[PDB]
DNA sequence: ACGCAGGTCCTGGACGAATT
DNA sequence: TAATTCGTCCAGGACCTGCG
């Protein structure tokens, strides 16, 4: 089971050169599954079929409680926790709990105090990019 | 006023599982 | 078994919203 072919990008081992070339597509994108609409590339054909719904607006995962539909089954699973009051994600620092995992991750950054987004007009610094974008509307409306 | 931050759901890379 | 395809988790983000 010796493997002598290595990828110079991630270091993974392969027994045949043909296996290394097939893997190397993950770094170059060459010959990866390509969407016929936008020509962006994905790691396998299943991820491509998933992305295909972004062009059709199909939402095949419907909540049986409220009737709303979602593009991904994981999104429906996260949404169902709202109905059930299930908040398994908690900030270890202050104890605030969330049903949404990204809401928890986003909140925990506030304990660091980092504000890496600075308004190019007035210099006001924000912890989040979406709040900086909304702040810049104030300058556009001022003009 | 508007800065703050939580609510919500879309997007796709990661990676083991299932299928071919 | 190896290659391919699938299911799923997860990270990141956009848009929305009311509070102080
Ligand atoms: Zn590699
Ligand atoms: Zn596309
Ligand atoms: Zn619902
Ligand atoms: Zn906290
Ligand atoms: Zn500004």
PDB file of N, CA and C in Angstrom, chain A residues 64-98:
ATOM      1  N   UNK A  64     -43.514  21.576   7.899  1.00  0.00           N
ATOM      2  CA  UNK A  64     -44.890  21.127   8.071  1.00  0.00           C
ATOM      3  C   UNK A  64     -45.649  21.932   9.117  1.00  0.00           C
ATOM      4  N   UNK A  65     -44.972  22.798   9.864  1.00  0.00           N
ATOM      5  CA  UNK A  65     -45.622  23.574  10.915  1.00  0.00           C
ATOM      6  C   UNK A  65     -46.185  24.883  10.374  1.00  0.00           C
ATOM      7  N   UNK A  66     -45.394  25.622   9.593  1.00  0.00           N
ATOM      8  CA  UNK A  66     -45.816  26.916   9.078  1.00  0.00           C
ATOM      9  C   UNK A  66     -45.938  26.975   7.562  1.00  0.00           C
ATOM     10  N   UNK A  67     -45.418  25.989   6.833  1.00  0.00           N
ATOM     11  CA  UNK A  67     -45.567  25.941   5.395  1.00  0.00           C
ATOM     12  C   UNK A  67     -44.458  26.595   4.598  1.00  0.00           C
ATOM     13  N   UNK A  68     -43.506  27.254   5.252  1.00  0.00           N
ATOM     14  CA  UNK A  68     -42.409  27.883   4.530  1.00  0.00           C
ATOM     15  C   UNK A  68     -41.450  26.828   3.988  1.00  0.00           C
ATOM     16  N   UNK A  69     -40.863  27.123   2.832  1.00  0.00           N
ATOM     17  CA  UNK A  69     -39.965  26.209   2.145  1.00  0.00           C
ATOM     18  C   UNK A  69     -38.543  26.758   2.145  1.00  0.00           C
ATOM     19  N   UNK A  70     -37.580  25.848   2.007  1.00  0.00           N
ATOM     20  CA  UNK A  70     -36.170  26.196   2.112  1.00  0.00           C
ATOM     21  C   UNK A  70     -35.380  25.487   1.023  1.00  0.00           C
ATOM     22  N   UNK A  71     -34.251  26.092   0.649  1.00  0.00           N
ATOM     23  CA  UNK A  71     -33.443  25.539  -0.431  1.00  0.00           C
ATOM     24  C   UNK A  71     -32.657  24.313   0.018  1.00  0.00           C
ATOM     25  N   UNK A  72     -32.360  24.202   1.310  1.00  0.00           N
ATOM     26  CA  UNK A  72     -31.531  23.122   1.822  1.00  0.00           C
ATOM     27  C   UNK A  72     -32.202  22.472   3.022  1.00  0.00           C
ATOM     28  N   UNK A  73     -31.995  21.161   3.155  1.00  0.00           N
ATOM     29  CA  UNK A  73     -32.583  20.433   4.274  1.00  0.00           C
ATOM     30  C   UNK A  73     -31.996  20.886   5.604  1.00  0.00           C
ATOM     31  N   UNK A  74     -30.709  21.243   5.623  1.00  0.00           N
ATOM     32  CA  UNK A  74     -30.103  21.758   6.847  1.00  0.00           C
ATOM     33  C   UNK A  74     -30.740  23.072   7.280  1.00  0.00           C
ATOM     34  N   UNK A  75     -31.137  23.913   6.322  1.00  0.00           N
ATOM     35  CA  UNK A  75     -31.814  25.159   6.669  1.00  0.00           C
ATOM     36  C   UNK A  75     -33.175  24.886   7.293  1.00  0.00           C
ATOM     37  N   UNK A  76     -33.900  23.895   6.772  1.00  0.00           N
ATOM     38  CA  UNK A  76     -35.172  23.518   7.378  1.00  0.00           C
ATOM     39  C   UNK A  76     -34.967  22.996   8.794  1.00  0.00           C
ATOM     40  N   UNK A  77     -33.939  22.168   8.992  1.00  0.00           N
ATOM     41  CA  UNK A  77     -33.637  21.648  10.322  1.00  0.00           C
ATOM     42  C   UNK A  77     -33.354  22.778  11.306  1.00  0.00           C
ATOM     43  N   UNK A  78     -32.570  23.773  10.881  1.00  0.00           N
ATOM     44  CA  UNK A  78     -32.310  24.932  11.728  1.00  0.00           C
ATOM     45  C   UNK A  78     -33.589  25.720  11.989  1.00  0.00           C
ATOM     46  N   UNK A  79     -34.448  25.837  10.976  1.00  0.00           N
ATOM     47  CA  UNK A  79     -35.677  26.610  11.123  1.00  0.00           C
ATOM     48  C   UNK A  79     -36.646  25.942  12.092  1.00  0.00           C
ATOM     49  N   UNK A  80     -36.698  24.606  12.092  1.00  0.00           N
ATOM     50  CA  UNK A  80     -37.640  23.899  12.956  1.00  0.00           C
ATOM     51  C   UNK A  80     -37.317  24.143  14.425  1.00  0.00           C
ATOM     52  N   UNK A  81     -36.035  24.321  14.756  1.00  0.00           N
ATOM     53  CA  UNK A  81     -35.660  24.624  16.133  1.00  0.00           C
ATOM     54  C   UNK A  81     -36.287  25.920  16.633  1.00  0.00           C
ATOM     55  N   UNK A  82     -36.645  26.837  15.731  1.00  0.00           N
ATOM     56  CA  UNK A  82     -37.324  28.063  16.140  1.00  0.00           C
ATOM     57  C   UNK A  82     -38.702  27.743  16.707  1.00  0.00           C
ATOM     58  N   UNK A  83     -39.461  26.889  16.012  1.00  0.00           N
ATOM     59  CA  UNK A  83     -40.797  26.530  16.477  1.00  0.00           C
ATOM     60  C   UNK A  83     -40.748  25.839  17.834  1.00  0.00           C
ATOM     61  N   UNK A  84     -39.732  25.009  18.057  1.00  0.00           N
ATOM     62  CA  UNK A  84     -39.638  24.197  19.262  1.00  0.00           C
ATOM     63  C   UNK A  84     -38.872  24.878  20.387  1.00  0.00           C
ATOM     64  N   UNK A  85     -38.410  26.109  20.186  1.00  0.00           N
ATOM     65  CA  UNK A  85     -37.641  26.792  21.213  1.00  0.00           C
ATOM     66  C   UNK A  85     -36.343  26.101  21.564  1.00  0.00           C
ATOM     67  N   UNK A  86     -35.762  25.366  20.620  1.00  0.00           N
ATOM     68  CA  UNK A  86     -34.542  24.602  20.857  1.00  0.00           C
ATOM     69  C   UNK A  86     -33.341  25.493  20.569  1.00  0.00           C
ATOM     70  N   UNK A  87     -32.606  25.864  21.622  1.00  0.00           N
ATOM     71  CA  UNK A  87     -31.446  26.748  21.522  1.00  0.00           C
ATOM     72  C   UNK A  87     -30.226  26.018  22.071  1.00  0.00           C
ATOM     73  N   UNK A  88     -29.636  25.106  21.292  1.00  0.00           N
ATOM     74  CA  UNK A  88     -28.508  24.313  21.801  1.00  0.00           C
ATOM     75  C   UNK A  88     -27.163  25.021  21.750  1.00  0.00           C
ATOM     76  N   UNK A  89     -27.065  26.169  21.083  1.00  0.00           N
ATOM     77  CA  UNK A  89     -25.809  26.898  20.954  1.00  0.00           C
ATOM     78  C   UNK A  89     -25.788  28.038  21.962  1.00  0.00           C
ATOM     79  N   UNK A  90     -24.762  28.061  22.810  1.00  0.00           N
ATOM     80  CA  UNK A  90     -24.641  29.068  23.853  1.00  0.00           C
ATOM     81  C   UNK A  90     -23.240  29.658  23.846  1.00  0.00           C
ATOM     82  N   UNK A  91     -23.156  30.960  24.105  1.00  0.00           N
ATOM     83  CA  UNK A  91     -21.863  31.613  24.255  1.00  0.00           C
ATOM     84  C   UNK A  91     -21.233  31.215  25.582  1.00  0.00           C
ATOM     85  N   UNK A  92     -20.002  30.702  25.524  1.00  0.00           N
ATOM     86  CA  UNK A  92     -19.324  30.260  26.736  1.00  0.00           C
ATOM     87  C   UNK A  92     -18.950  31.419  27.651  1.00  0.00           C
ATOM     88  N   UNK A  93     -18.922  32.642  27.132  1.00  0.00           N
ATOM     89  CA  UNK A  93     -18.472  33.793  27.909  1.00  0.00           C
ATOM     90  C   UNK A  93     -19.605  34.391  28.733  1.00  0.00           C
ATOM     91  N   UNK A  94     -20.741  34.691  28.101  1.00  0.00           N
ATOM     92  CA  UNK A  94     -21.844  35.351  28.786  1.00  0.00           C
ATOM     93  C   UNK A  94     -23.093  34.492  28.918  1.00  0.00           C
ATOM     94  N   UNK A  95     -23.136  33.321  28.289  1.00  0.00           N
ATOM     95  CA  UNK A  95     -24.247  32.408  28.456  1.00  0.00           C
ATOM     96  C   UNK A  95     -25.434  32.634  27.545  1.00  0.00           C
ATOM     97  N   UNK A  96     -25.368  33.606  26.637  1.00  0.00           N
ATOM     98  CA  UNK A  96     -26.471  33.829  25.709  1.00  0.00           C
ATOM     99  C   UNK A  96     -26.636  32.620  24.798  1.00  0.00           C
ATOM    100  N   UNK A  97     -27.876  32.175  24.631  1.00  0.00           N
ATOM    101  CA  UNK A  97     -28.181  30.972  23.874  1.00  0.00           C
ATOM    102  C   UNK A  97     -28.883  31.320  22.568  1.00  0.00           C
ATOM    103  N   UNK A  98     -28.681  30.469  21.564  1.00  0.00           N
ATOM    104  CA  UNK A  98     -29.232  30.680  20.234  1.00  0.00           C
ATOM    105  C   UNK A  98     -29.718  29.361  19.656  1.00  0.00           C
TER     106      UNK A  98
END
